Amino acid sequence: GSLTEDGLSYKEKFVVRSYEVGSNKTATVETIANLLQEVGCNHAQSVGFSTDGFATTTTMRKLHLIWVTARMHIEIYKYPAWGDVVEIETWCQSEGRIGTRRDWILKDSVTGEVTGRATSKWVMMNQDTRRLQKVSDDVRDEYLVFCPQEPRLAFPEENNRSLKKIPKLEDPAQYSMIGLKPRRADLDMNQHVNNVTYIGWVLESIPQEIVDTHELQVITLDYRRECQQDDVVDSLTTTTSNDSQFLHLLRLSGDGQEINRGTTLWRKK
Amino acid sequence: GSLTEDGLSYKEKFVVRSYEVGSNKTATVETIANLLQEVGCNHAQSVGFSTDGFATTTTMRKLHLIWVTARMHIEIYKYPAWGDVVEIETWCQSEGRIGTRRDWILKDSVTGEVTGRATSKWVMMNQDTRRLQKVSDDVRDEYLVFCPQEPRLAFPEENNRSLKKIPKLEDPAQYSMIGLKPRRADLDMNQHVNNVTYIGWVLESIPQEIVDTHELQVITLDYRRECQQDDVVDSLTTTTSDSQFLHLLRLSGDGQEINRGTTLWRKK
Ligand SMILES: O=C(O)c1c[nH]c2ccccc12
Numbered sequence: 001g002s003l004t005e006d007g008l009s010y011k012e013k014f015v016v017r018s019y020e021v022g023s024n025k026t027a028t029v030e031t032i033a034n035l036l037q038e039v040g041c042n043h044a045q046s047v048g049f050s051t052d053g054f055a056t057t058t059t060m061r062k063l064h065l066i067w068v069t070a071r072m073h074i075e076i077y078k079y080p081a082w083g084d085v086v087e088i089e090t091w092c093q094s095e096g097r098i099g100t101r102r103d104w105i106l107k108d109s110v111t112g113e114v115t116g117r118a119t120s121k122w123v124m125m126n127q128d129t130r131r132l133q134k135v136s137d138d139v140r141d142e143y144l145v146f147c148p149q150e151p152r153l154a155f156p157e158e159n160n161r162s163l164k165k166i167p168k169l170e171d172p173a174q175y176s177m178i179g180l181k182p183r184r185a186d187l188d189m190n191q192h193v194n195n196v197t198y199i200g201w202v203l204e205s206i207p208q209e210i211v212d213t214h215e216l217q218v219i220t221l222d223y224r225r226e227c228q229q230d231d232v233v234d235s236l237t238t239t240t241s242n243d244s245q246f247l248h249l250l251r252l253s254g255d256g257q258e259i260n261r262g263t264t265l266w267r268k269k
Numbered sequence: 270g271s272l273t274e275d276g277l278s279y280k281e282k283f284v285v286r287s288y289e290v291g292s293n294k295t296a297t298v299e300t301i302a303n304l305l306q307e308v309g310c311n312h313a314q315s316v317g318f319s320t321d322g323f324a325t326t327t328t329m330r331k332l333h334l335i336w337v338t339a340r341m342h343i344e345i346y347k348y349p350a351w352g353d354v355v356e357i358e359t360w361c362q363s364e365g366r367i368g369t370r371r372d373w374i375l376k377d378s379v380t381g382e383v384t385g386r387a388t389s390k391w392v393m394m395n396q397d398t399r400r401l402q403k404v405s406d407d408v409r410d411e412y413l414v415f416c417p418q419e420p421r422l423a424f425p426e427e428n429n430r431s432l433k434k435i436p437k438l439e440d441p442a443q444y445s446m447i448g449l450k451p452r453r454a455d456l457d458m459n460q461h462v463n464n465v466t467y468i469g470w471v472l473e474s475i476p477q478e479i480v481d482t483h484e485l486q487v488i489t490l491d492y493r494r495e496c497q498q499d500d501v502v503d504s505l506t507t508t509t510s511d512s513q514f515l516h517l518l519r520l521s522g523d524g525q526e527i528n529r530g531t532t533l534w535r536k537k
Pocket residue numbers: 312313316318323324325326336360361362369412413415416
């Protein structure tokens with residue numbers, strides 16, 4: 001991988017592996033989400049930021065501050081086949097004191113065609129107290145020099161799906177998958193559950209008949225609270241809709257505390 | 270990746286990714302096992318065999334025959350760090366009518382040093398009846414031309430750890446992790462549980478204190494029966510000692526054995 005000529009974005013190529021594909025012999029959305037994370041991490045390393053998933057600056061480390069994902073939105077037009085080369089370009093932009101946004105564009109390396117796009121909202125949090133906070137001026141100037149100054153959006157459209165509010169699923173859910181637990185492979189280097197695991201857990205409550213006859217086109221996921229290594233999760237889904245749409249909710253198995261909410265849009269094969 | 274000059278082995282380089290490493294910022298044994306599978310798959314493709322993980326020849330496809338793993342043995346001297354380039358060389362050898370063996374050597378790309386080695390035993394099975402069978406002459410000649418004719422072993426040493434018999438853990442287990450279930454990410458393209466998932470399930474019953482103070486050096490795993498997509502597994506472990514453990518994976522309900530294994534851990 002490498003930073004582009006202007007040094008304001010990063011590009012990297014990946015060859016889709018045998019264990020990364022599903023029943024269609026094309027990459028799963030969890031494989032895509034992992035590659036998005038990998039290219040984000042290589043971009044942060046290329047400009048001197050922390051490499052640990054928190055992308056911290058020198059001032060953030062002293063203050064015990066970290067970047068945490070608040071929302072992930074992914075749209076796939078074509079999933080790359082096993083053996084195909086996919087090129088991913090990523091960039092970061094500040095959204096004032098609210099937080100930062102990381103965007104991605106996925107392309108077929110051979111044709112140069114846009115096969116997918118993604119956007120994510122990140123917020124600053126003290127890693128010990130878990131208290132959210134606005135971005136200060138001192139932290140901001142340290143990373144403004146690595147972001148384009150004019151707006152660059154993966155989802156430029158006026159009322160795009162990436163900014164829609166997600167409602168809370170009401171009991172009873174139409175479908176559910178209960179008692180989901182992370183194993184060591186689901187953890188990152190800091191022993192926290194990897195953000196992509198939650199995508200997998202959301203998708204667990206989609207009936208196999210939908211997965212066999214449809215392809216996932218769009219997924220929007222809000223992250224409200226973290227699943228601890230010793231927590232148990234219930235995944236709930238209700239159909240809201242040729243296209244099929246669903247509302248999703250992940251909550252702790254016991255007390256029903258919300259950890260994530262989301263929506264998915266599926267097109268008939 | 271590419272077949273080597275003599276066309277009897279295959280080599281491929283991998284850069285260790287951020288999500289592939291554990292608490293030590295080095296690749297997990299599950300990441301290693303996935304890369305071994307990937308290089309095996311690229312070797313089969315390079316010589317015209319099936320894609321799907323079953324590495325079938327033309328005659329096997331007509332007879333509904335597949336290759337299935339019976340045992341996996343991996344020894345790691347150094348886990349590659351995040352961002353490091355690891356080179357993996359793989360080759361196959363027939364073991365008469367018993368089945369086939371696939372071996373691997375892992376190296377640090379910069380130093381050229383051997384950082385790990387692995388071996389696996391594969392048996393032929395009818396995909397529909399799941400009945401094991403010896404390898405016929407007709408199936409054999411089709412793949413003998415892709416194997417070295419003189420023996421080439423990743424574990425040459427006499428009485429090496431890759432061929433030791435594994436006993437059955439007796440109840441009560443010292444440690445356990447119950448109710449383990451696969452999710453869609455644990456499945457391969459054929460909707461079968463990926464062989465590497467069983468390694469993760471075995472390791473789930475190792476106490477976190479061992480994982481924090483030791484590094485996994487050797488793992489030997491026997492595959493007896495497959496976990497279906499709707500099955501539930503219990504992972505059992507007992508200390509037999511460096512620290513050594515005996516492992517057992519069995520179905521949560523009736524206690525049917527799916528795997529047995531052993532692990533050897535070195536103090537950090
Ligand atoms: O798939 C098989 O049966 C194979 C036996 N020897 C090999 C060498 C390379 C790739 C696949 C095989």
